[PDB]
Structure formats: structure tokens, C-alpha cells
Amino acid sequence: KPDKLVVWENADDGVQLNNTKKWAGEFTKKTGIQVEVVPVALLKQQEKLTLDGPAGKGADLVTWPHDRLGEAVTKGLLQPIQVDNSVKNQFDDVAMKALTYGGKLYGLPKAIESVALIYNKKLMGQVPATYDELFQYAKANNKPDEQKYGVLFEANNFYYTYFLFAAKGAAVFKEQDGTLDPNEIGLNSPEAVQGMNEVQKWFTEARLPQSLKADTVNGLFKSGKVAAVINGPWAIKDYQAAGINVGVAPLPKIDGKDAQTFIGVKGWYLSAYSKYPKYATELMQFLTSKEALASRFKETGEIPPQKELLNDPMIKNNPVVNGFAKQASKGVPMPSIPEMGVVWEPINNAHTFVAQGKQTPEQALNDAVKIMKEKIQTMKQ
């Protein structure tokens, strides 16, 4: 009786891995079914499954941002799921839509997420009311030489800097009753140039360091040297373990207008190569029940897009959640079409080149989209 179920979970050597290990053990306690939980980096799971899945060595359950759903559907990595109407009903509509591709549902949500303004309460009293003032605050307080900042964030990552292309009226793809068009990339429009002009000023005026990464942003904030970062819910537990008195506010309004961040839904998905699609959907349900997502929030800090859980005033008005949820409500879901995968590397290289003073915002952007359009073809044929 060789009966095992395999789950791939983010390799955080901590809170996200642990929670899924716990609830997968309870399922093993309840059903007798052996459920192994392999830690695989959130962003490395899709490529691993591309190799392992068709070789019978893949996981049954996998997870990554809804960002890359569609490419996975197109590449035969995932199969749709069938769950009861009552189960389907327990989840946030925005979350469930982000997990739906070509009319079909590919997963159950674990987390609804957006970046917000997270601040060290002993360095920042009240949050700057506007973006202009948040910026002037960075201009005045940032000092790379002493490694102390008023504002630090991944200003070389398009996932972070997007509220800022969006403020200018720039989009990733064209608006044909949605995000329906792969062939009309808006990332080299005049409004996109203005957005990159704003990214540039973060390295030019606000003097953010070149070669930034999440480790640099987190480490400096944790060592108490940064007043405020732009980061997401996933970082809170880590900050609080380092003992920061974290406050969470929405992003200060920009141009007298709501900041428009990306919205990310992290889901469990069913591998198209799972030999046990029925029993794995059962597992996926067990992992996303109200009781499991209650415990996940408390352990990971990651906001579950479960309707009854979002309802609770102890979760809705929690100061460490409130700001994220409000900002999330002002956001747009990341596009989920197959050709979104093409965007990340070019546009982020374009950020590095501008930040570095190697290429102008106009040339960096024009180069980026030409590369993007070229890659749309490698997908085809």
C-alpha cells in the first residue's frame, strides 16, 4: 500500500513551512494518508514542477502567486479543481477570481496581499500624509553611508514600483474590458516613462542603494535603522520577532489619489500530473478550511481571503492588518495571462539600468518591451 501525498511549501525554515506541516499532519491523523511536505522556494516551485511533474516525481499540491497562473495552465502544469458550492462560497470573490483562468478555477486561496507603508513606531510618529511628503522625508533622512534611512524599499523591483507607473496612468497590458491584450504592452508609453522618472528619483534624490534586495530592506529595518519600508504582510512576523514596534499604514496618497498597488493572491494548486486528484483536492480543502486559515493568519501574519475570517473585528480592525486590507482594496490584481511571465525580467533589468545611471528611463523602457515582445514568440510556435 504505497500511499503518499506530496505538498510543496515555501522554504522559509520557519512560520509558513511549519503551519502547513502542522495541518498536513492533522490530515494524516484524520485520514491515515501519508502527506509529505517538501520546502521549495515559492518562486522555484513552478520550474521544478515543469521538470519533476511529468517524471512522476512532482508534488500533488503546489503554491505560488496567481501572477503565474495561465502560463502554468498553458504549459499543462495544473488542472482545474472541483469543490462543493458551499466550499467555493467561503472565499473572497477577488481572491477566487485571481485563481480562475479561462472560466475554470485552479485553486483555493491562502492569502490576499498588497504592499503597504510599514514603519518602526519609535522612528516614525505619524505617517506622512502624502507621497510628496513621504518623498521629501526620504530626501531629508536617507543616508546610505551610515546605512540609515527614513524610507527604504525595493525600488528596483517592478512589483513594488508599480503604484507609481499606475499613478501616471501606465498599464502593463491594454484595457479591452479587462487585461485582455498581450500585444499592447503599455510599459513604454509616455506615462510609463514618467513612472520610471519617479523610480529614478528614488536612487537620484532619495539615494537608495544600487543592487537592492529584500534581504537588505528587511535586515536594515530589523536592526532598527529604517523609519519606514514599503513591504507586505509576509514580513510582519519577521519584524516583530526582531522586536520592531510595527505600525502599518496605507501608502500615502499620490497626486491627491489612492495609490494603486498590485494585489497578489497565493493559492494551493492541483498538479496536472497528480495521480490522486480527488484525494489532493480533499487535502487542499483541509488546508484552507476556516480553522486552518485562522491558525495560518495567527502564525504567518498572512491575510486569509476567507469571508467569515475577514468579517471578525479582531482581524478586520487589527492595526497590523487594517492598513494592508485598505490598501489592498485600492489595488488591481496582477495580470494572470500567460504572457505576464515575459514581463518581470525585462522590466526589472530596466529598473537596474536606470538606477545605476547606465540607461535613461526612455531607452531602458523601449529596450525592455522589445525584449518582452520578442519573448511572446518563444512561447508560441
Ligand X SMILES: OC[C@H]1O[C@@H]2O[C@H]3[C@H](O)[C@@H](O)[C@@H](O[C@H]4[C@H](O)[C@@H](O)[C@@H](O[C@H]5[C@H](O)[C@@H](O)[C@@H](O[C@H]6[C@H](O)[C@@H](O)[C@@H](O[C@H]7[C@H](O)[C@@H](O)[C@@H](O[C@H]8[C@H](O)[C@@H](O)[C@@H](O[C@H]9[C@H](O)[C@@H](O)[C@@H](O[C@H]1[C@H](O)[C@H]2O)O[C@@H]9CO)O[C@@H]8CO)O[C@@H]7CO)O[C@@H]6CO)O[C@@H]5CO)O[C@@H]4CO)O[C@@H]3CO
**Shortest distance (Å) from residue 59 CB to ligand X:** 16
Task: Print the binding letters for residues 207-226 with ligand X: x by CB under 6 A, - otherwise.
Answer: -------xx--x--------
Q: Using CB under 6 A, which of 53, 65, 323, 335 touches ligand X?
A: 65
Beta pairing class for 149-153 and 116-120: unpaired
Closer CB to ligand X, 35 or 217, in the complex: 217
Check binding of 94 to ligand X (CB under 6 A). Answer: no
Distance CA 8, CA 21 (A): 10
Q: Using CB under 6 A, which of 26, 159, 295, 326 touches ligand X?
A: 159
Phi, psi of 56 (to 5 degrees): 75, 10
**Which residue bears the cell 501525498?**
5
Grid cell, residue 106, equals 485552479
Closer CB to ligand X, 10 or 285, in the complex: 10
Closer CB to ligand X, 89 or 356, in the complex: 356
* Rg of the chain taking only CA atoms, in angstroms: 21
Q: Give the total of residues touching ligand X (CB under 6 A).
A: 22
Residue type, 104: K
Beta carbons within 10 angstroms of residue 2's beta carbon:
4
Q: What is the DSSP letter of 258?
A: -
Check binding of 300 to ligand X (CB under 6 A). Answer: no
Q: Using CB under 6 A, which of 7, 15, 63, 68 touches ligand X?
A: 68
Nearest to 137 by CA among 125, 145, 34: 125
Closer CB to ligand X, 247 or 333, in the complex: 333
- Are the C-beta atoms of 266 and 148 separated by less than 8 Å? no
- Are the C-beta atoms of 280 and 60 separated by less than 8 Å? yes
Check binding of 157 to ligand X (CB under 6 A). Answer: yes
Enumerate residues 3-22 that contact ligand X by CB under 6 A: 10-12
Distance CA 137, CA 207 (A): 12
CA 367: distance to chain centroid? 25
Enumerate residues 322-381 that contact ligand X by CB under 6 A: 344-345, 348
**Shortest distance (Å) from residue 25 CB to ligand X:** 21
Check binding of 188 to ligand X (CB under 6 A). Answer: no
Contact positions vs ligand X (CB under 6 A): 10-12, 41-44, 65, 67-68, 113, 157, 159, 214-215, 218, 232, 234, 264, 344-345, 348
